[PDB]
């Protein structure tokens, strides 16, 4: 059975910049007799279904533009991105099909920009949901780059581990950002004996850390 | 118009059977090969076999050798896959994808899960320097999705919805903000439509300071 190994499985890339990716067939997909390579490369984006940009190893697809282009032959193959545009962030994949199919494992594609620093939120707890017996406090970092960020909870200058989840959108397919959600569950109980939530933001674009902070009943 | 539309998603307990369906139009059925494509939540696509459009003649890859049928429906122009004894491990995007060509069903989602469906609660995000923000929390659901909208469908620049969580309840949350001007809030209406088809849950959430 004929293996298909990717690389690299992760790449970011600045918008304008040229993309590579790699993909090693075990065994030869050029048919003889028709001198055509049996491969494909697909683009999948979240929630869709996989994406054609290129068969016979560099036929572009009906539609799809000139940056994506394919090469290679035998058991080496590229697919080029040659001027990488914003919305292009995906998972591609290659794929062999002269002896059933085989995808590559996929490699995820993210867009690098300027740094920029994000807007930070803080929300209470609602009556509405501390009548049902639980508080959630939502931290919100807003339309910044790069995603790697701190976000620290603090209740009544407690530091708060492991009873908090973060959710972060995908990569802003026009200008690149992302926005990020840190959440703090407590039991109503728990929440009502304390009197300052605190949410304390580090981040690159940031001069120095960011606390936003509510006192219980303000 | 050439296309594959699998049917919808599906919530199955550990044990269960499943079958999807695979409806091809726009081109001769039977002159094409189908394939099935698996994918696990945040994994890559693996082929899981193969089907003769003609003769219904399967041909299965190695992981998929036990608990998998593939079938058809010549008349219908429908390919389906059948999975027996469900495991945990089965939970994942299904494709069927025609040989030759961009081709490919919308995807069928299966879920294998002893938990049952749950509605959603809805609580507001409520109100800095300039901007102001505000948001609906959609929390203790299952299973996705939920959909969130603002103002109808009238209100789309600056909002986010967050993807889901799972919570050690095992049941989902997420949050919705949409960030505007300080200025314009008092004069301005912020409502939040929350959809979770599975539940038939439909809320709409007015949110202010």
């Known amino acids: 059975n004929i293996m298909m190994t990717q690389s690299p499985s992760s790449l970011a890339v600045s918008a304008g910049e040229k993309v590579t990716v790699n993909c090693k067939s075990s065994?030869?997909?050029?048919?003889?007799?028709?001198?055509?390579?049996?491969l494909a490369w697909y683009q999948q984006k979240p929630g869709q279904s996989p994406k054609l940009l290129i068969y016979?190893?560099?036929t572009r697809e009906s539609g799809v533009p000139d940056r994506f282009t394919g090469s290679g032959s035998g058991t080496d193959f590229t697919l080029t991105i040659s001027s990488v545009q914003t919305e292009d962030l995906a998972v591609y994949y290659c794929?062999?099909?002269?002896?059933?199919?085989?995808f590559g494992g996929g490699t995820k594609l993210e867009i690098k920009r300027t740094v920029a620093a994000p807007s930070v939120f803080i929300f209470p707890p609602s009556d509405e949901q501390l009548k049902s017996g639980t508080a959630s406090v939502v931290c919100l970092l807003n339309n910044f780059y790069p995603r790697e960020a701190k976000v620290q909870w603090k209740v009544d200058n407690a530091l708060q581990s492991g009873n908090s989840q973060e959710s972060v959108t995908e990569q802003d397919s026009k200008d690149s950002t992302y926005s990020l959600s840190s959440t703090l569950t407590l039991s109503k109980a728990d929440y009502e004996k304390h009197k300052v939530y605190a949410c304390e933001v580090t981040h690159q674009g940031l001069s120095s850390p960011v606390t936003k902070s509510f006192n219980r009943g303000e | 118009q050439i296309q594959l539309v699998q049917s919808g998603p599906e919530l199955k307990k550990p044990g269960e059977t499943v079958k999807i369906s695979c409806k091809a139009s726009?081109?001769?059925?039977?002159?094409?090969?189908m394939n099935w494509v698996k994918q696990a939540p945040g994994k890559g696509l693996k082929w899981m076999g193969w089907?003769?459009?003609?003769?219904?003649?399967?041909i299965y890859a190695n992981d998929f050798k036990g608990r998998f049928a593939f079938s058809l429906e010549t008349s219908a122009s429908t390919a389906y896959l059948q999975i027996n004894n469900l495991k945990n491990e089965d939970t994942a995007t299904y494709f069927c994808?025609?040989?030759?060509?961009?081709?490919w069903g919308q995807g069928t989602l299966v879920i294998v899960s002893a938990a049952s469906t749950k509605g959603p609660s809805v609580f507001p995000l409520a109100p800095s320097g300039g901007t102001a923000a505000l948001g609906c929390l959609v929390k203790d659901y299952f299973p996705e999705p939920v959909t969130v909208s603002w103002n109808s469908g009238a209100l789309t620049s600056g909002v986010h919805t967050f993807p889901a969580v799972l919570q050690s309840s095992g049941l989902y949350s997420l949050s919705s903000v949409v960030t505007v001007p300080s200025s314009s809030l008092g004069t301005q209406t912020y409502i939040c439509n929350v959809n979770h088809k599975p539940s038939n849950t439909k809320v709409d959430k007015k949110v202010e300071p």
């Open positions: 994808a025609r040989d030759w060509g961009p081709y």
């Open positions: 726009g081109y001769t059925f039977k002159n094409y090969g």
């Open positions: 089907i003769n459009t003609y003769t219904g003649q399967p």
């Open positions: 065994q030869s997909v050029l048919y003889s007799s028709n001198q055509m390579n049996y």
């Open positions: 016979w190893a560099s």
């Open positions: 794929l062999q099909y002269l002896s059933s199919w085989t």
